[PDB]
Amino acid sequence: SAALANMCKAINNASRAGKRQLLLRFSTEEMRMFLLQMLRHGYISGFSYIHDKRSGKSIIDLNGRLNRCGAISPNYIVKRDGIEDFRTRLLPARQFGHVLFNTSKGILDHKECLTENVGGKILGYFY
Amino acid sequence: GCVRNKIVKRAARTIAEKYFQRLDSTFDHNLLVVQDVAVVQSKKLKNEIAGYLTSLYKKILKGTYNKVYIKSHEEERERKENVIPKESMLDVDCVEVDDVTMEMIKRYGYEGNFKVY
Amino acid sequence: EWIPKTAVGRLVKMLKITSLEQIFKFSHVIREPEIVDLLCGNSIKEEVLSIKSVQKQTRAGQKTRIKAVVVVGDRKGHVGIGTKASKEAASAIRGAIARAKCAIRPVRLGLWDGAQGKPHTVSCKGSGKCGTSVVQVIPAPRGTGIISGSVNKKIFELAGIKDLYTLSFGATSTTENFAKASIAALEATSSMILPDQWEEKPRTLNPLLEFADILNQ
Amino acid sequence: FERRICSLGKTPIASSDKASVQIVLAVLDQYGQVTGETTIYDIGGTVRRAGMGDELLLEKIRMEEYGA
Amino acid sequence: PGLFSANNLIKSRKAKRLADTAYRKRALGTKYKHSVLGRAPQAKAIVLEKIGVEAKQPNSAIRKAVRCQ
Amino acid sequence: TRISDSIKIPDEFVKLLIVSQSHLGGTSTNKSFARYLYGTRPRDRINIIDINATWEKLIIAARAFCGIKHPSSIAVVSTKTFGRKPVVKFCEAVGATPITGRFIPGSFTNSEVKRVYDPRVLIVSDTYADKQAILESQYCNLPTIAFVNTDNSLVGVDIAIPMNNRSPSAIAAGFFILSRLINYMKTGAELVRDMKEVELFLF
Amino acid sequence: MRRNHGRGKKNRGSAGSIQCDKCGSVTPKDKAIKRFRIQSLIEQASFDDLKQATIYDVFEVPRMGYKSQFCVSCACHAKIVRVRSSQARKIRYGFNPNRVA
RNA sequence: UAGAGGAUCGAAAUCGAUUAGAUACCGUUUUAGUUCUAGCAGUAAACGAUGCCGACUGGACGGGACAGUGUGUGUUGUCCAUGAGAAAUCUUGAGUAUGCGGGUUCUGGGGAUAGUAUGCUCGCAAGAGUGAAACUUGAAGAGAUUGACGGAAGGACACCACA
Ligand SMILES: [Zn+2]
């Protein structure tokens, strides 16, 4: 989760400069679960990663649609009744944005966690 | 201390631009005109507008003095300078191209007579 | 009596530009304060926010001078701010109103939740800054009011808002910095990409190329 | 409320962007003549002011007007 | 600030709080030690002398006071 | 790549561009360049610039000019003296508006100056020389065309025709070549109909 | 005032000291003002009388080089160095060892 | 503090000047000290007044080491943007949004009393480290602007200045 926060600062830097692609010289397993949840929601075009028997590599394809992404350290523990307070602190409006949690069913955003009756540890957000 | 103020300089440029072709290069002629055109009272002022004009005239009419754009004079000085010279740059044929300029020629395949150095 | 002086001013005289949202769309600089009286005719209110005194020392006497800050907007989506310093107070207020008009901008409005109704509040959160003064706006539920300070209130009413929360930080008793930090907090909520700006549109020509023939003859 | 969208960065363009510009090109008839149509491009002040707004414009013209 | 670090934060923030003067008089229990009437809001006294005091400049005056017990 | 310039053919203009030294740049080059460039020789350490580059961009610059219906609102600017003659010639052959001499700060923004202007497109013969005219375009929503040489800055410029600026011959060569395209692409004119009127353009 | 902080020293702690040539005060060597000059050994208003006095048929008059070193108070007072304006303070002058003669 | 040594300079002391008076600046006679060996002590505008480690980021002209051959890695000086800042200014950071969370420490909480009392630990001492309160008080402070002044520096001038 030190690799998750490093990735979000490098994405904010390129999305502000108008880049199309981003190459990072590292790649972890839960860094790739966070990126697969931005792809199915429409915020990036795609990505791909290389195997080199070093720390890994990853290439992100940006879109033009991202306003910001972040990570929360440390990963607090939130019951299913406390999901909704973390949403009013992190997203600008009530109609868009996604807060992601690491639950006992995988990685879900805050709309799914309410339709499955679970809580977990917070990872990050993006809008 | 023989400097001419702005009201007497600024006036002589208005005269040299409108009634320009009425003026020639002697003091006794240009003074007769400024009595016709301008309306001042002091006889010392016309004497200095007329004396500054005769210096402007043999500058404008012989060599170089820009900063005034005389409409009627921008034809005589232009029709004699646009005389096409005896040689254009489309006459030489032994074009001594260089080496790297040469290999840029054939890769695009240009036409002509390019003699390398 | 208004003999226009620029291209955009000439078209407004000939009724080729009928709204103000035709100029904002292509970012054309407004140079004359009469282009705003005639396109938002007699729905433009004014508010004098502040007046104080400035002093300078020279080799020929101490010059006292008066500064005014003024804001304008109709009540719907436009608002602007201007300021000037002249000798007496009547010519300073009157000169700072011509500058406020030439800086009108649009403001995006939205709903607190859902997608149905007519817009009443701001479209998201935003902040602005001007010399250690910091203003935060937060969208409010319907039938709430405008909870904020006094001089903040006159800016958010002339823009057409009905519900809002604010929190401020820093040195806000510099009333001209406090008024500029809160005009920049509305330019920030209106500058975020929303998911309905995601699909593109067809392109068009600005009004200086559509009406090219009318300009000459 | 509406904002144009930049043609080179997909960023929406504000109304106080007084360095933003609009470019129209002639729809070139075959055999080297003009037929009567144009293609519009919109640019924002940020891209234009940093100095790289030139390397990106001809890249885009190669995809829409001389692509293949 | 890890998730298992709450004893390091209570120890650290209690020590910073003592740098506030108002809090320090209450925490060390010495808020009524040097005080001429202690915890009372008013007090009685018998009058010994009747004096006059100068104002502090830039004010010219003489304010009337009394010495009591 | 080579599809925008292949829709027309540099018919014999390879002579007029090589004879007048319109491909000889300078000693220095920035990482902005090295994409318009071909190579630099070891003899004088001079940089050579591609000829397709100068031909790819002249095709685009001519299409932006023709996009404006009334061509009496395309000011051309040149301060230096080598451009006084070429610029004034490239305004009767086309129909633009010439601005020569020194540029007065406030021409576009001030409405109380000697002469006031309001063009819809701007053409410049040198960036570093006509510094003021580029800088003032960023207050009135104005596109610009330039003749960047080798070391200039490209800020505030949209279309950059990489050519030579120093020599008095190369300056007149560029304005001649572009002059015929604007007549060629508007009316039924000829591209190579004479090579003797390029003497009327030189200073 | 200055980005030097007044002296040409980078990435070292201490830098050695000298004693000023006029008053004799102790100063860092990188902060002192230093000047080099080449003077003729005989004055120029005396060369004619020296061409009739010489016994050799070919004579060259000698020249010596001198390096000087002063403190900030002694160079400012002696007008070896003057007060400059804010922007002109940044101009440095050198020697160019690759000059041809 | 002990031994060795002693060219130069020089606190303290001392005369001679200067001055209204100078126990001072300037000078004369003359010391401890200034050097080496063995130790004690533990302070500095010990300063870039600028914690340590990790991720990411435009140009131009240089230097120093190694390796290659038209370049690379570790370091480093100057100058310009973007960005930041209360500003002066900062450019491997004083940048990466109040759009606020990468890991882990220390220090500050209006001025003055005061780094002073008292207790304790260390030192041959000189002292260092840690460290209050009663009583007092409306400002003390940072950066920049226009004036006024300098027993401040320049450039022009004038028989109420010289030649
Ligand atoms: Zn000295």
Which characteristics define this entry?
7 chains; C: 217 residues; alpha+beta; four-stranded mixed beta sheet; 7 helices; F: 203 residues; alpha/beta; five-stranded parallel beta sheet; 5 helices; 27% helix; globular; binds zinc ion
Briefly characterize the structure.
This is part of a larger assembly, with 7 protein chains of 7 kinds. Chain B has 117 residues and is mainly alpha-helical. Chain G is 13% helix and 22% strand.
Explain this structure to me?
- This is part of a larger assembly, with 7 protein chains of 7 kinds.
- Chain A has 127 residues and is an alpha+beta fold.
- Chain A contains 3 helices and 8 strands, in the order H-E-H-E-E-E-E-H-E-E-E.
- Chain A has helices spanning 2-17, 29-39, 83-90, and strands at residues 21-24, 46-50, 57-61, 69-71, 77-78, 98-103, 106-109, 120-126.
- In chain A, strand 6 (98-103) and strand 7 (106-109) form a beta hairpin.
- Chain A starts with a helix and ends with a strand.
- Chain D is globular.
- In chain D, strand 1 and strand 2 (33-43) form a beta hairpin.
- Chain D is 24% helix and 29% strand.
- Chain D is of the alpha+beta class.
- Chain D has a two-stranded antiparallel ribbon with strand order 1-2.
- Chain D has 2 helices and 2 strands.
- With 203 residues, chain F is an alpha/beta fold.
- Chain F has 5 helices and 7 strands; from the N terminus they run H-E-E-H-E-H-E-E-H-E-E-H.
- Chain F has helices spanning 13-19, 51-66, 84-89, 131-137, 168-186; strands at residues 37-40, 47-49, 74-78, 97-100, 121-124, 144-146, 159-160.
- A 5-stranded parallel beta sheet of chain F has the order 4-3-5-6-7, sandwiched between helices. In chain F, strands 1-2 form a two-stranded antiparallel ribbon.
- Chain G is of the alpha+beta class.
- In chain G, 13% of the residues lie in helices and 22% in strands.
- In chain G, the strands form 2 sheets. A two-stranded antiparallel ribbon of chain G has the order 1-2.
- Chains in contact: A-C, A-D, A-E, B-F, C-D, C-F, D-F.
- The interface between D and F is medium-sized, with 31 and 33 residues.
- The complex binds zinc ion (ZN).
- Residues 20, 22-23, 25, 70-71, 73-74 of chain G line the site of zinc ion.
- The structure holds one RNA strand of 163 nucleotides.
State the helix count of chain D. 2
Q: Please state the overall shape of chain B, judged from the principal axes of the Cα atoms.
A: rod-shaped
User: In terms of structural class, how would the helical and strand content of chain D be classed?
Assistant: alpha+beta
Give the oligomeric state. Answer: part of a larger assembly
Largest sheet of chain D: 2 strands, antiparallel
Main pleated-sheet profile of chain B: none
Largest interface: D-F, 31 and 33 residues
Q: Going across the major beta sheet of chain D, what is the strand order?
A: 1-2
Structure annotation, total helices of chain B: 5
PDB class: ribosome
Keywords: genome decay, microbial parasite, genome reduction, Encephalitozoon cuniculi, lose-to-gain, ribosome
Entry title: Cryo-EM structure of the ribosome from Encephalitozoon cuniculi
Chain A: 40S RIBOSOMAL PROTEIN S15A (S22 in yeast)
